[PDB]
């Protein structure tokens, strides 16, 4: 989610560290708008188109 | 010293070794150019014999591509690989002496 820059074509972002939103140094933890770097699609089975 | 955690493999194994450890004037020169386009890491390679012993021989030659890889990874650093270990004669161990 929301990598701080843009990507170079055909590359893999293999990261775990939490992307600093709201200027928060986080130890993989939360805080003042310190959201998790990854995101999983909530594809409920047989959802809308 | 670490786990595999890898996905890519490209190896060709015609096996022979002719190291011929010598202290003579250099007659073998390899050259490798490393770069990347669109992620397609290209590695150009060439080898030639020379005559000089100490400095770099100044002439002209050409290089050609030898391998390409779809690495798809950001690259910032590189370090070379050296291999040297002595017999029992050297008391300084592998990491210690050579």
Swiss-Prot record, chain B:
Changing residue 62 to V: In strain: 20A.EU1. Changing residue 92 to V: In strain: Omicron/XBB.1.5, Omicron/EG.5.1. Changing residue 30 to K: Partial loss of biliverdin affinity. Residues 13-25, 86-98 are annotated as: Disordered. Changing residue 74 to Q: Increased resistance to neutralizing antibodies. Changing residue 93 to N: In strain: Lambda/C.37. Glycans are attached at residues 5, 74. Attaches the virion to the cell membrane by interacting with host receptor, initiating the infection. The major receptor is host ACE2. When S2/S2' has been cleaved, binding to the receptor triggers direct fusion at the cell membrane. When S2/S2' has not been cleaved, binding to the receptor results in internalization of the virus by endocytosis using host TFRC and GRM2 and leading to fusion of the virion membrane with the host endosomal membrane. Alternatively, may use NRP1/NRP2 and integrin as entry receptors. Binds to host ACE2. RBD also interacts with the N-linked glycan on 'Asn-90' of ACE2. Cleavage of S generates a polybasic C-terminal sequence on S1 that binds to host Neuropilin-1 (NRP1) and Neuropilin-2 (NRP2) receptors. Interacts with host integrin alpha-5/beta-1 (ITGA5:ITGB1) and with ACE2 in complex with integrin alpha-5/beta-1 (ITGA5:ITGB1). May interact via cytoplasmic c-terminus with M protein. May interact (via N-terminus) with host bilirubin and biliverdin, thereby preventing antibody binding to the SARS-CoV-2 spike NTD via an allosteric mechanism. This is Spike protein S1. It comes from Severe acute respiratory syndrome coronavirus 2. The gene is S. The chain holds residues 161 to 258 of 1273 of the full protein.
